[PDB]
Scaffold this active site. Structure first.
Site, PDB file in Angstrom:
ATOM      1  N   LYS A   4       0.825  -1.199   0.000  1.00  0.00           N
ATOM      2  CA  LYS A   4       0.000   0.000   0.000  1.00  0.00           C
ATOM      3  C   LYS A   4       0.858   1.247   0.000  1.00  0.00           C
ATOM      4  CE  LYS A  47      13.028 -18.402   0.373  1.00  0.00           C
ATOM      5  NZ  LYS A  47      12.604 -18.025  -1.010  1.00  0.00           N
ATOM      6  CE  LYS A  79      10.561 -17.978  -7.242  1.00  0.00           C
ATOM      7  NZ  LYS A  79      10.375 -17.564  -5.820  1.00  0.00           N
TER       8      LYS A  79
END
Ligand SMILES: N[C@@H](Cc1c[nH]c2ccccc12)C(=O)O
Ligand SMILES: N[C@@H](Cc1c[nH]c2ccccc12)C(=O)O
Lengths: 326, 326
Positions: B111, B192, B195
């Site tokens: 937001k 980690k 993509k």
């Protein structure tokens, strides 16, 4: 012809005020325009509902709309949820409307000073209503003063979508009711007549039995003058009653004044009680004939069917633009 | 058997980490459990999308899943938008979920300090996600630590609906991948592999070509201690590689350690690079076969069919309870 979309909240009770102000005039409009009468049951679920009562009110409303004189071969009458495109297109639009737009809606005030326990349905129902409209390339949307706000938003979504993905939707126009009179509460002639009035004596329902119509009109508030003359201010109550009397019997106000010349309210009310009963009788007859008949379902069936035909081609084109599926 | 539901965002670029952590395990599991692989294209539309790309990535990903080994006669693989019951059930769920629950959703952080101009769909995709899962009576949903929050809500909605209208939904459970193999990034061994990493050399795409695999692996970060020994702390990079190596070639970590006892990172990397190339080779082929083969759509078609067959049924029951339609 030009298209007209009208959504009906399933609630099983519509007043002589609704009938006189808008509904009644539709029977005429349905020949000039291409009308769609959707019983928006998905919108009715944004607030608590009893399942059985809602299922019932859906049949009632359809029974009553035909009873009043809607022609299922001329116009299209259907239940919102039996035409999947509504919900499908509602999602696609939710994705182009900003949170702010829905939050700054002059109706979401229902959030009541910190309620929090408000269905997201309340917040999100406008984009569904935009779907209801836009899916059929409608031109006119016969809404009241109050709804105007939603019309503007759908207009906005339509164009936003059109410019981003191409000319697809028709920008709808919010047309107002014909009336030119307005039917006030029988108990407070300044307030407007509505189903949602806490006092039942305030309105007359198209399914009120004679005994009840008789009872409610006797109670209608008049004044102390004792004369049957039209006076907006000064004589609110009488003027209302005269308004109801005139539109239903086809007699002018000048006429009715002249008729009730030296007569008092006692008989005037007794006369009106009759003109109302004589007017609702066929409607209540036809209505019950429709509630008993399995031809009702066959009507809703071809209604949806006719609606689905258009809705689908619209969604196909929507999914096509957005890039969804294959 | 028990049902497993998995929604896949269309992106056409899944990493060797996704593959090792989840995808691989399914080629096996798909024979015991009942599996649904849903390409959630309706969800992908809550954010800006280019029609062509989205249209494309949906195929690419369907292709990919089959290439990796999803047997369409064993499991169901479908596109989300092609099964209307998803949107339909999404709406009914938006109606029993409170706006608070959606705001206190730790993800709505997008937001942006009051950016305000966010698609309402962003605030509302949780009910759709609940739909996706609940429509198929799924028992297990393989989501990472990240999605847990959403599974909690759907568990909630499911429970709420069951109490109001009666036992209808299975309260799902979020069951994670098999622990041990957490594939970190090639450039930052504490981060980690994703993509969504801004550095391309942090991950390897199932379709990365040999020359690219070779280059990325070589650049993988290592320590200076120069020994091939597992050390979670101190030696992050080498342990990552040793993990990728192990899970792919099937050798134990110790086995690899011994097998490299007196070797340097130069050769170890050269070896790893080829065992990666060897593993993707058949996948990259099968992928191109499926892409241009018209059989892909046929597979998707029977996917819609199978999915819809269950979805439609559940919706029918939901509409029954809520009190919608006839
Ligand atoms: N809440 C509006 C909703 C609505 C839904 N569909 C519509 C179609 C036309 C006009 C209004 C609507 C009403 O009761 O009027
Ligand atoms: N946002 C989740 C959404 C999701 C949609 N459908 C699902 C079905 C199962 C699990 C997650 C989902 C994701 O990208 O993973």
């Amino acid at each position: 012809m030009k298209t007209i979309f009208s959504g009906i909240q399933p609630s099983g009770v519509i007043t002589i005020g609704n009938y006189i102000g808008a509904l009644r005039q539709f029977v005429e409009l349905q020949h000039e325009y291409n009308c769609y009468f959707c019983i928006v049951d998905q919108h009715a679920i944004t607030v608590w509902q009893d399942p059985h009562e809602l299922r019932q009110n859906i049949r009632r409303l359809a029974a009553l709309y035909l009873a009043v004189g809607i022609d299922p071969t001329q116009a299209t009458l259907f239940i919102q949820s039996e035409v999947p495109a509504h919900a499908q297109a509602a999602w696609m639009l939710q994705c182009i409307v900003y949170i702010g737009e829905l939050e700054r809606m002059t109706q979401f005030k229902e959030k009541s000073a910190g309620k929090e326990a408000v269905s997201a349905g309340l917040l999100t129902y406008p984009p569904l209503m935009a779907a209801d409209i836009l899916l059929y390339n409608t031109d006119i949307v016969p809404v009241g003063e109050d709804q105007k706000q939603h019309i503007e938003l759908t207009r906005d979504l339509a164009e936003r979508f059109n410019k981003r993905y191409g000319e697809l939707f028709t920008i709808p126009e919010a047309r107002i009711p014909k009336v030119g009179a307005r039917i006030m509460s029988l108990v407070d002639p300044t307030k407007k007549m509505s189903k949602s009035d806490p006092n039942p004596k305030a309105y007359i329902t198209l399914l009120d039995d004679a005994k009840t119509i008789e009872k409610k009109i006797k109670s209608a508030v008049t004044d102390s003058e004792g004369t049957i003359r039209y006076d907006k201010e000064a004589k609110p109550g009488i003027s209302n009653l005269l308004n109801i009397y005139s539109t239903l019997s086809g007699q002018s106000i000048e006429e009715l004044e002249r008729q009730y010349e030296g007569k008092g309210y006692g008989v005037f009310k007794a006369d009106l009680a009759q003109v109302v009963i004589e007017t609702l009788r066929p409607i209540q007859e036809r209505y019950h004939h429709w509630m008993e008949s399995e031809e009702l379902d066959r009507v809703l069936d071809e209604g949806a069917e006719k609606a689905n035909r258009v809705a689908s081609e619209m969604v196909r084109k929507m999914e096509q633009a957005m890039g969804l599926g294959r």
